[PDB]
């Protein structure tokens, strides 16, 4: 159901765009219901254990189920009062004192009731955690992926330059375990990023001897002492790249003698003959390193220890002892370096006790290392679930790094896993395997909202674990008291500090619908457990090859956080394990199938991707033999049958913001990055019309977000209105016949986070059929499904007497008069009644020193009336604070005595509207304290809220009653047709009298149950709302009532407001410029805006010119349609023109015309096309220059873009033909009014007497060092002296100079500033003394 189309683009749809806010919704949806992942998996540290220090045998708490069970205050009421969208966290425990076998406590068991373990905040319908009234939005984290990875560290580390590789195991919840090399090839280890210690110490800590450690890494080489000589187990492959020091011979044949080197040919000769036994000298064995210990069996004396260097003397003792097997290490200087031997050489600890004590001293340096403390500390490092965890994902990722078979395993690391990581690191050091990449997407998980909340809850449970264990261990009473054991403060504060206090939970930038969707789909690399700012570097921030498909290259912002914060792609989606997947069409060797597969970061590199730019046949195979394709991280070529996969759509890459740009391909990437940032800040204008030169994706963007009210169940519209909309379901209702209907409330005239007027308006008319999933009621910055950030302006590219200077915009008076860029704001002014030691501040209308203007705006109580026009100076809420004493100077007492005293003991602190702004009061409010005298206006407003809500609920019940009675009467007229006899009965008679047997009477029983349910639900909802309305309203811990005043203002397009286009075309409005003196053509039509042409050529944003030229073609067909509509029907059913308009796009592909339909139905679509024809140029496969030239025809226009225009003031024609068109501009945020400050004199700070405000005036402008350098350069000593002392921070100098300025003397009369004098006192406060001598 749509009365507007517009069509363009060549390539097919294939796969439609998914839910835009799927990642935000699905992540939080996981953390709630499912087992071993979300909420249940969050309590993995409190599923089995919680053993109370081995007291009463063992014992436990044991979690068993939970559930939330509805809300408390709801989302709408949580916006008004300062309270989050909360939901009570119940959880049934079961305290038991069951041991293993016999004695102590004997199987009690309670099955205790559920306890309130804090309160976790729930997500709204469209992804938003409401906290204390504010909207809020939790952005996704892009941290480093858990598991293990070998870092490069290549280049100049410490001069010379020689690789220095290193391994590093990153845990999910535990301590880090690094493993790095040095210049001398020594293996170190870093426990939780600490001081370096020998890697063999960790092996000793896991109960491994020096001989056992030697047999793990290096290969042994046995030597035999027989027949008074030295033999050796020769291995041919081991002698590759080594010089022969002795005569290598076997079986009476000298293969390689002693001198020259051993080549690969000698290895083939040795391997062919099968030589595994040859004689060797004493000097050759001296070079090797002995593996195990060797004691002399004759005397019992130890001849050298493990890992010691051999010698001529040592080998003589070993031969004399009578040992038949001399175990030694082989090694080399290429593929098998002696790293573990060198690490053992510089290792102090020789056993498990010394290793654990050394590790205990390194970790916790202070207390003396004991037996239990040293073992338990090492045990709680990488061998315990409470103090170490790789999760289900990191262990799977660790297995892939080590080349394992299975992907499942334990959380904590084993003894074999550490040795395997060290073995792979040793292989990577030599020449086996390659290094990993940090910038690649394979080692970068997407930690969303669900993971962070469960992680914070895991920390909160760890806090309560020590309290529960200590209390249960000490106490041993027969009574349970399990609900009172676990406190609510620890769990609630853990969740509350993360949700609306910690980083990542930023304010929801809801200027427009695109800003909310872009904010929800954002992904930052910094925050809790990741990057920051000072680190970061060139890598990571730069756009990697794996980003193509996952994230947008252009959408990342400027400044300090450029590269760290990247937006998610359109077709992208988060994987199950944590990685970022991306869709791709399956091509089964030649023919491209209709199926789609989500390829991971690592998985995508293996297969051969293919671009969507290459055209295909009618159905199946490709056109060209060789086309463009991506494979192995490079954009090479391939054969026709070689391609495995294909691109899903043309806009697979890039974000939703970049996709909204019309001619994105024609614009530069630098300007496109600015153009993405230019959007979102586009404020919601009054009556937002649909954009002419569109993309097509804007239709999905508005419907994706919760701004526009989409139809849940399709049917027919019953009652349409500004207040609400009600649609009868009609076609296929629910299972049980419990009435049709579908009430849509639709919020209207509400303030946003950026002070923007958020409202909803009914697009669909009364008595109109509508299908499921369509825009019933539109929202702010939209036009019946299609999004609209601004309004279309008749632009003109030409110079205009220095008005459009360095990217300045020259507007027209017709734009301001029509109210095209008129922004409606909604400010909220507060007025808190405080309570001092002297007395309590009361809100009253009897304010001291006030005339007739008080009672004009304010009421009898002292609050402004709803709908009164206010200005900068008028009082909104009257209030006075008690303050006696005074004293009063002699002149003031005599002055008061002359004109009546009236010196009351009370000051004034009424909530007045700020000087400058002005508007109308929309809605007042009053949050009264619990146990205080309620005001007359407060009771009147509360009575209005109670009456309106009760009438709304009563009318809501009446709407359901009309549908329910119609549904019952429809069912009742099939079997027992009363017909004209019916429709003259009461209410009670209608309920009675049912049908016969079969499916009729049984359905009517459930209808009566649903009718009685609605009757009971009306009283329950009314009683709940009545209790909530007339509640205590407990505010903050200050005192007394408070009064909020929502006043709306309407600002016009003043000269200075920052207005910009869609292709990074930044601008500022210069002057007003009347319609009489503006650029006009042969006809009477003038120009809406006049932009400078010099800006288009400097920055490569040529797509803006394409948007202007195509906009003229879009407007041209609209003028032709308006010409047909005006002066009667004329043609009457002119479908051939509209069919030719839709069809004629170079006769390419992808279009539909009015084949079906009828008269009047076409007139609905034709009336919408009067303003503009509208176009949908996608992004990559957009409208070409030839198609735009074709679009220039039909509606009658110059096939070029140029057009001769008269001046307006003079009336003469311009020399060159100027480029006129329709550019889709938009009024951005910031603007004038807010960005405009001035201050002569105001308040000052207590610490240092320097200009500051906010309460009444604004704070003074800062000079700084850069300004002082310019003042010193020019030689303005008096200007710098006045700015430093008297103008800024001189106590006596400011008042003296101000008195001189009032008298007309000027001068200065300066002195020593308070900033310097405080430094003198601060320096003198210490032991040093500073004194200013005279001369």
């Amino acid at each position: 159901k749509k009365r507007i189309r517009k069509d363009f683009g060549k390539r097919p749809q294939v796969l439609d765009v998914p839910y835009l806010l799927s990642i935000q919704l699905d992540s939080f949806q996981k953390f709630i219901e499912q087992d071993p992942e979300g909420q249940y998996g969050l309590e993995a540290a409190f599923r089995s254990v919680f053993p109370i220090q081995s007291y009463s045998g063992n014992s436990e708490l044991q979690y068993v189920s939970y559930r939330l069970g509805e809300p408390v205050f709801d989302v709408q009421e949580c916006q008004i009062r300062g309270v989050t969208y909360s939901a009570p966290l119940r959880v049934k425990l079961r305290l038991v004192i069951y041991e293993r076998e016999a004695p102590e406590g004997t199987v009690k068991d309670i099955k205790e009731q559920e306890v309130y373990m804090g309160e976790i905040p729930l997500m709204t319908d469209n992804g938003t955690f409401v906290i204390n009234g504010t909207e809020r939005v939790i952005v996704s984290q892009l941290h480093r992926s858990p598991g293990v990875f070998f870092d490069s560290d290549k280049g100049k580390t410490h001069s010379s330059g020689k690789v220095l590789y290193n391994a590093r195991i990153i845990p999910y919840r535990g301590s880090w375990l690094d493993f790095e090399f040095d210049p001398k090839d020594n293996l170190f280890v870093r426990i939780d990023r600490r001081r370096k210690l020998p890697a063999t110490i960790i092996l000793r800590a896991l109960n491994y001897t020096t001989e056992q450690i030697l047999d793990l890494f290096f290969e042994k080489v046995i030597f035999e002492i027989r027949d008074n000589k030295l033999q050796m187990e020769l291995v041919p492959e081991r002698l590759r790249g080594e010089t022969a020091s002795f005569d290598i011979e076997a079986n009476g044949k000298v293969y390689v003698e002693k001198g020259r080197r051993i080549t690969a040919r000698h290895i083939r000769q040795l391997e062919k003959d099968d030589v595994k036994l040859i004689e060797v000298p004493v000097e050759y064995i001296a070079g090797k390193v002995v593996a195990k210990d060797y004691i002399d069996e004759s005397t019992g004396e130890l001849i050298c220890a493990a890992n010691m260097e051999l010698s001529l003397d040592l080998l003589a003792k070993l031969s004399q002892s009578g040992h038949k097997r001399i175990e030694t290490l082989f090694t080399n200087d290429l593929d098998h370096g002696p790293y573990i031997s060198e690490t053992l050489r510089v290792d102090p600890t020789n056993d498990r006790l010394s290793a654990l004590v050394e590790i205990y001293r390194m970790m916790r340096p202070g207390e003396p290392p004991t037996r239990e403390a040293a073992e338990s500390l090492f045990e709680n490092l990488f061998f315990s679930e409470d103090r170490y965890d790789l999760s289900a994902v990191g262990r799977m990722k660790f297995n892939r790094s080590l080349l394992r078979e299975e992907i499942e395993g334990s959380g904590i690391l084993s003894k074999d896993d550490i040795i395997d990581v060290m073995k792979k690191l040793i292989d990577i050091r030599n020449g086996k395997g390659e290094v990993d990449d940090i910038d690649h997407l394979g080692n970068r998980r997407i930690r969303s909202v669900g993971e962070m909340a469960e992680n914070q809850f895991r920390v909160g449970l760890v806090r309560v674990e020590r309290a529960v264990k200590e209390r249960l261990s000490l106490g041993d009473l027969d009574t349970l008291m399990p609900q009172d054991m676990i406190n609510a403060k620890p769990i609630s504060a853990a969740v509350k500090e993360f949700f609306g206090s910690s980083q990542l939970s930023q304010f929801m930038d809801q200027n427009n619908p695109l800003s909310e969707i872009t904010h929800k789909r954002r992904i930052s690399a910094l925050g809790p457990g990741g990057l920051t700012r000072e680190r970061a570097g060139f890598e990571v921030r730069d756009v990697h090859p794996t980003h193509y498909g996952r994230v947008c290259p252009i959408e990342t912002p400027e400044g300090p956080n450029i590269g760290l914060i990247n937006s998610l792609s359109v077709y992208a989606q988060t994987n199950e394990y944590g990685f970022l997947e991306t869709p791709y069409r399956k091509v089964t060797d030649g023919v491209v199938t209709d199926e789609i597969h989500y390829l991971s970061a690592i998985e995508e590199g293996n297969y051969v991707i293919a671009q969507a730019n290459s055209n295909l046949d009618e159905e199946g195979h490709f056109v060209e033999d060789l086309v463009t394709c991506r494979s192995k991280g490079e954009s090479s070529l391939f054969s026709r049958d070689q391609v495995d996969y294909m691109d899903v759509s043309t806009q697979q890459v890039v974000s939703v913001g970049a996709s909204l740009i019309p001619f994105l391909e024609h614009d530069d990437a630098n300007r496109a990055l600015m153009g993405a940032n230019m959007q979102r800040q586009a404020v919601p204008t009054l009556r937002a019309d649909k954009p002419l030169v569109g993309t097509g994706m804007e239709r999905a963007v508005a419907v994706d977000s919760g701004v526009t009210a989409v139809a849940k169940r399709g049917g027919v519209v019953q009652y349409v209105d500004a207040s609400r909309i009600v649609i009868k379901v009609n076609e296929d209702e629910m299972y049980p016949g419990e009435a049709g209907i579908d009430i849509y409330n639709l919020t209207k005239y509400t303030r946003s986070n950026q002070n923007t007027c958020i409202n909803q308006m009914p697009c669909v008319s009364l008595g109109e059929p509508v299908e499921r999933g369509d825009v019933l009621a539109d929202g702010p910055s939209t036009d019946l499904g299609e999004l609209a950030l601004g309004q279309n302006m008749r632009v003109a590219f030409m110079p205009w007497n220095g008005y459009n200077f360095e990217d300045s915009i020259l507007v027209s008076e017709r734009v301001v008069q029509e109210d095209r860029f008129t922004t409606i704001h909604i400010q909220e002014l507060a007025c808190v009644s405080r309570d001092t030691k002297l007395g309590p501040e009361e809100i009253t209308a009897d304010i001291p020193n006030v005339g007739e203007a008080a009672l004009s705006k304010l009421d009898e109580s002292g609050i402004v009336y709803i709908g009164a026009e206010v200005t900068g100076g008028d009082i909104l809420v009257g209030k006075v604070t008690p303050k006696g004493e005074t004293q009063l100077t002699p002149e003031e007492k005599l002055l008061r005595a002359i004109f009546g005293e009236k010196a009351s003991d009370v000051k004034d602190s009424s909530l007045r509207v700020p000087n400058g702004v002005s508007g109308t009061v929309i809605d007042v409010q009053v949050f009264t304290r619990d146990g205080v005298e309620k005001d007359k206006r407060a009771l009147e407003i509360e009575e209005m809220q109670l009456k309106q809500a009760k009438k709304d609920l009563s009318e809501e019940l009446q709407i359901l009653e009309a549908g329910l009675f119609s549904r019952i009467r429809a069912v009742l007229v099939a079997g027992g047709v009363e017909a004209e006899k019916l429709d003259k009965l009461p209410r009670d008679r209608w309920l009675e009298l049912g049908l016969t047997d079969e499916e009729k009477q049984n359905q009517l029983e459930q209808l009566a149950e649903q009718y009685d349910e609605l009757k009971h639900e009306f009283e329950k909802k009314l009683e709940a709302k009545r209790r909530k309305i007339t509640q205590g309203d407990d505010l903050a811990p200050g005192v007394l009532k408070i009064v909020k005043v929502y006043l709306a203002v309407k600002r016009r397009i003043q000269p200075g407001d920052k207005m910009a286009g869609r292709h990074g075309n930044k601008g500022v409005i210069s002057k007003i410029n009347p319609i009489e003196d503006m650029p006009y053509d042969e006809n009477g039509t003038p120009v809406d805006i006049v932009l400078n042409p010099l800006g288009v050529p400097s920055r490569m944003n040529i797509g803006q010119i394409l948007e202007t030229h195509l906009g003229m073609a879009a407007k041209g067909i609209g003028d032709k349609i308006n010409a047909m509509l005006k002066q009667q029907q004329e043609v009457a059913k002119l479908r051939e023109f509209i069919q030719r308009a839709y069809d004629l796009g170079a006769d390419v592909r992808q279009k539909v015309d009015l084949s079906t339909f009828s008269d009047e139905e076409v007139m609905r679509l034709a009336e919408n096309l009067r303003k503009g024809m509208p176009i949908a140029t996608p992004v990559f496969d957009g409208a070409k220059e030839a198609e735009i030239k074709e679009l220039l025809k039909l509606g009658d226009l110059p096939t070029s873009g140029q057009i001769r225009l008269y001046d307006g003031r003079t009336g003469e024609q311009f020399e060159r033909p100027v480029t006129v068109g329709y550019m889709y501009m938009l009024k951005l945020n910031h603007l004038v009014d807010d960005k405009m400050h001035a201050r002569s004199t105001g308040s000052y700070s207590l610490v240092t007497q320097q200009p500051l405000g906010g309460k009444a005036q604004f704070g003074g402008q800062r000079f700084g060092e850069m300004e002082v350098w310019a003042l010193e350069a020019y030689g303005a000593a008096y200007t710098l002296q006045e700015m430093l002392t008297v103008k800024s921070d001189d106590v006596n100098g400011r008042t003296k100079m101000y008195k001189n300025i009032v008298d007309g003397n000027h001068q200065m009369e300066p002195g020593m500033p308070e900033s310097f004098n405080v430094l003198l006192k601060e320096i003198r406060s210490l032991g040093i003394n500073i004194e200013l001598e005279d001369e």
């Binding site: 020399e1215 003074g1260 200007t1279 103008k1287």
Partner: protein, 643 residues
């Protein structure tokens, strides 16, 4: 101090002083009762810890306390490592064509709030307000006549404007306050280049000179009229920007025929012919009576009437030129680089007042003529070359032959990418040269009999050949093609962007171009902060010395010569010696000529050319040498400033 509704806000020094007082009091009590050696010594160490923490925490451990996890701010921390000022404000910038050089559009509400005390004093002095409180009530309720009093207050009272990124001395500049009905601060287009300011939502701050000497300092030193020339280089800082230069470029450009002919006139009378149609504008080599004016030796002015073959635009633009100067030949050239040179020569010959009025006249005439021209940027302006596909196919054929050679050994496969990059770079030069040669000349026209050529009036080419933000590389990227794109690793890609901005761009090439845009923005962010980091070290070291002791003796100095890269590259630059004091009579081919301490003037520097190319070495006094004690000699320094 008590905050809002209880909850006091105390400093960390109160906690440190209380801890030191408590430990010292316990130590005093310990030295009185039973005195154990362990207890008394430990309390003394605790008193040392409290006293050390109070003076300066910093190093050893850091004493926490006071709930918060962060350390307490000690006395040393308070003074270890931005001066807010009253009578100031800020607002969004805007263009103001009608304003003069020494003028800036200040808002009515902002100027009223800024000059509060002056308005109160001026009101009470004349009459109207009986007292100061009455003037405050009269000023609060803006009652018409107060605005008239505000006009008198800011008549000859300079307001100091200022930008955010204050690099040089020209960042802060003063101007006469002009009242404007609006909420945005207007500014002069000529002085926008000095501040490095654009109209993309940039805001500037204003400051009012309260003191009498401060107002004189703003007028004499900090004024925009005084700051004509740059401090770094002798050339003009407030030269005509994009819009004005494009209009002056349009005012030249001699197009043959097209309502041309040699219809003679006398200067000012040609303006009547231009406004009344008939004749075109940049038509032909039309003759006209040019009344020139020159001076020599004894100063004065000497007239010189003559019939020079100029254009209608050059004849009309000649009225804007001052009394002095060469005349005709300045306007006869064009508007691009010589537009700034004409202003520099006018400033050197005439003075400050004549050059300032000429700058305002050139800005007004440039803006008006640029409006009358109507130069646009259509789709057909950037005309692509016909031999782009042919050159790309030929370059791809050469690269295919090189790849085919590498397949069968022959050439060095290790360095084949460098030679292939040279082939693509040569193809990029061929596409750039073909696009430039076609877009530069072009055209046909009808010179009397019809059949001729001159230069393409194609908007972008006119913008490119007249400053106006239009380089050769940007124009090459638009119509021609983007060259060798940079990769993330550092190396260049072997397949450059064959397509351009005029044509369609593929997803692969745009993805590759995103790395250049991301790296360009990131490097610009780093280099911007790094420039200020280097400037802080330069300022900290240098900002003690000043020119003092009038002018000391000392002849010795650096022998100034032309920076010769001509040994094996052809590159000369003999503009170093200008406004520099001579060491001592620095010879001449014969005798005499140069004086002892004579500063090389602008005209006297031209006299060095009269001594031929042989004299390319002159000893000059510099700031490196000089026999001054604690400063610098005024002669040894030079002159190069705005003055």
């Amino acid at each position: 101090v008590p905050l809002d509704g209880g909850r006091f806000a105390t400093s960390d020094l109160n906690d440190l002083y209380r801890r030191v007082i408590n430990r010292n009091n316990r130590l005093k009590r310990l030295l009185d009762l039973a005195a154990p050696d362990i207890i008394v010594r430990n309390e003394k160490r605790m008193l040392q810890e409290a006293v050390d923490a109070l003076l300066d925490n910093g190093r050893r451990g850091r004493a926490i306390t006071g709930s918060n996890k962060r350390p307490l701010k000690s006395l040393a921390d308070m003074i270890k490592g931005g001066k807010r000022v009253d009578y100031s404000g800020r607002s969004v910038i805007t263009v103001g064509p009608y304003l003069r050089l020494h003028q800036c559009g200040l808002p009515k509400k902002m100027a009223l709030e800024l000059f509060k005390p002056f308005i109160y004093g001026k009101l009470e002095l004349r009459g109207l307000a009986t007292t100061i409180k009455a003037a405050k009530k009269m000023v609060e309720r803006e009652e018409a006549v107060v605005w008239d009093i505000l006009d008198e207050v800011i008549r000859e009272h300079p307001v100091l404007l200022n930008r955010a990124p204050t690099l040089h001395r020209l960042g802060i500049q003063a101007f006469e306050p002009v009242l404007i009905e609006g909420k945005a601060i207007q500014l002069h287009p000529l002085v926008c280049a000095a501040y490095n300011a654009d109209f993309d939502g940039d805001q500037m701050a204003v400051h009012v000179p309260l003191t009498l000497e401060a107002q004189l300092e703003a007028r004499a030193l900090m004024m925009s009229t005084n700051n004509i020339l740059s401090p770094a280089n002798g050339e003009p800082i407030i030269v005509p920007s994009q819009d004005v230069v494009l209009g002056l470029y349009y005012m030249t450009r001699d197009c043959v025929n097209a309502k041309g002919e040699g219809m003679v006139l006398t200067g000012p009378k040609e303006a009547e012919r231009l406004y009344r149609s008939g004749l075109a504008s940049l038509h032909a080599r039309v003759k006209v009576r040019i009344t020139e004016y020159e001076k020599d030796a004894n100063g004065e002015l000497v007239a010189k009437t003559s019939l020079k073959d100029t254009t209608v635009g050059r004849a009309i633009l000649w009225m804007i030129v001052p009394k002095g100067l060469p005349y005709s030949i300045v306007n006869q050239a064009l508007g691009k680089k010589a537009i700034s040179k004409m202003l520099n020569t006018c400033y050197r010959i005439l003075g400050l007042k004549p050059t300032v009025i000429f700058a305002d006249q050139i800005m007004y005439t440039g803006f008006a003529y640029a409006a009358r021209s109507g130069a646009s940027v259509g789709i057909d302006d950037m005309v692509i070359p016909e031999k782009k596909h042919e050159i790309i196919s030929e370059a791809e054929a050469e690269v295919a032959e090189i790849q085919e050679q590498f397949q069968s050994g022959l050439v060095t496969a290790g360095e084949r990418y460098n030679k292939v990059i040279d082939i693509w770079a040569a193809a990029n030069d061929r596409v750039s040269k073909a696009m430039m040669d076609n877009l530069q000349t072009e055209t046909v026209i009808n010179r009397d009999g019809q059949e001729e050529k001159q230069v393409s009036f194609n908007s972008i080419y006119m913008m490119a050949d007249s400053g106006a933000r239009g380089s050769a590389a940007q124009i090459r990227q638009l119509a021609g093609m983007r060259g060798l794109m940079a990769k993330p690793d550092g190396s260049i890609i072997e397949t450059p962007i064959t397509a351009n901005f005029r044509e369609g761009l593929n997803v692969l090439q745009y993805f590759i171009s995103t790395h250049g845009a991301r790296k360009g923005l990131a490097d610009t962010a780093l280099k911007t902060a790094n420039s200020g980091y280097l400037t802080r070290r330069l300022v900290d070291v240098a900002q003690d010395l000043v020119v003092t002791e009038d002018d000391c003796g000392t002849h010795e100095g650096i022998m100034m010569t032309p920076v010769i890269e001509g040994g094996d590259v052809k590159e000369p630059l003999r503009d170093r010696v200008l406004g520099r004091v001579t060491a001592e009579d620095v010879l001449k081919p014969g005798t005499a000529d140069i004086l002892v301490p004579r500063n090389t003037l602008l005209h006297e520097q031209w006299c060095d050319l009269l001594e031929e190319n042989s004299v390319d070495a002159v000893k000059v006094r510099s700031v490196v040498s000089c026999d001054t004690d604690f400063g610098v000699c005024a002669h040894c320094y030079g002159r190069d400033l705005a003055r």
